[PDB]
Design a protein around this ligand. Structure first.
Ligand SMILES: *[C@@H]1O[C@H](CO)[C@@H](O[C@@H]2O[C@H](CO)[C@@H](O)[C@H](O)[C@H]2NC(C)=O)[C@H](O)[C@H]1NC(C)=O
Ligand SMILES: Cn1cnc2nc(N)[nH]c(=O)c21
Length: 246
């Protein structure tokens, strides 16, 4: 499974960790040169463990669902924390079993719930490697309100960067200074599903999207994506959510 140490980390090692993370996900085929994630997987094989070390060397192990890259829960010393949702509960049966105590967070793992519990929308939460180091720190010692904020940072600096090279770049720019995410970043995060389905719906349709995907851009200008010729498809998105899961 994969590892990343914030100590002595620079834009380069981060890039390498994200690359390892992408390669750690199984896929059988590619769609328009892109890894298509598996429809489903059975058993403990459905989960990837990320070992993260903050600057001082403390660690938390995070469980990721390899069919969609969703964070399911994590382990901190001897306590495991899982999201309050069906998938996370199913996941609790194959990972962190040697945990002495298991705690269910008072919310499911989607941005919407996480922003409510955290009291802030993610447009106002600064991300970057320094923020990741603090997120790790905040998760070592339970606090549901603080954990909500920490998880919004953790998802973005890992799962979202895995899915979009642009977001990986946004985090490399933020390796020594945190900064709230750009509008592009957030609409990208929100479109992973839509884009994933459309790219797949295009392979029997000459690469033309059945229905266009609207995104906010680098500057803040609304922009339509209608075919697989766009940058987003040619050199941004890196993983595709199988339509089976949409
Ligand atoms: C596919 O989508 C692209 C946009 O990514 C369309 O691009 C046309 O040409 C340039 C970009 O190459 C844009 O300035 C235009 O707005 C688009 N042309 C017009 C006249 O609107 C491209 O036409 C689309 N269609 C196909 C079959 O690729
Ligand atoms: C990014 N994202 C959106 N919904 C999500 N739900 C869970 N459980 N984990 C995630 O990382 C996630």
């Amino acid at each position: 499974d994969v590892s990343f140490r914030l100590s002595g980390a620079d834009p380069s090692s981060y890039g390498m960790f994200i690359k390892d993370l992408r390669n750690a996900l199984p896929h059988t085929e590619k769609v328009y040169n892109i890894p298509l994630l598996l429809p489903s997987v059975s058993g403990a094989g459905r989960y990837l463990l990320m070992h993260l070390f903050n600057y001082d060397g403390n660690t938390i192990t995070v469980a990721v669902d390899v069919t969609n890259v969703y964070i399911m829960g994590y382990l901190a010393l001897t306590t495991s924390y899982f999201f309050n949702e069906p998938a996370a509960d199913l996941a609790s049966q194959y990972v962190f079993r040697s945990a002495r105590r298991k705690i269910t967070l008072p919310y499911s793992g989607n941005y919407e719930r996480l922003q409510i519990a955290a009291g802030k929308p993610r447009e106002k939460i600064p991300i970057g490697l320094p923020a990741l180091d603090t997120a790790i720190s905040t998760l070592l010692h339970y606090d549901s309100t603080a954990a909500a904020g920490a998880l919004l940072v953790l998802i973005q600096t890992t799962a979202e960067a895995a899915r979009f090279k642009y977001i990986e770049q946004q985090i490399q720019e933020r390796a020594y200074r945190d900064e709230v995410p750009s509008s592009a970043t957030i609409s990208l995060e929100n479109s992973w599903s839509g884009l994933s389905k459309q790219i797949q719906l295009a392979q029997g349709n000459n690469g033309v999207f059945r229905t266009p995907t609207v995104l906010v851009d680098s500057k803040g200008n609304k922009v339509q994506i209608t075919n697989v010729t766009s940058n987003v498809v040619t050199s941004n998105i890196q993983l595709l959510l199988n339509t089976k899961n949409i």
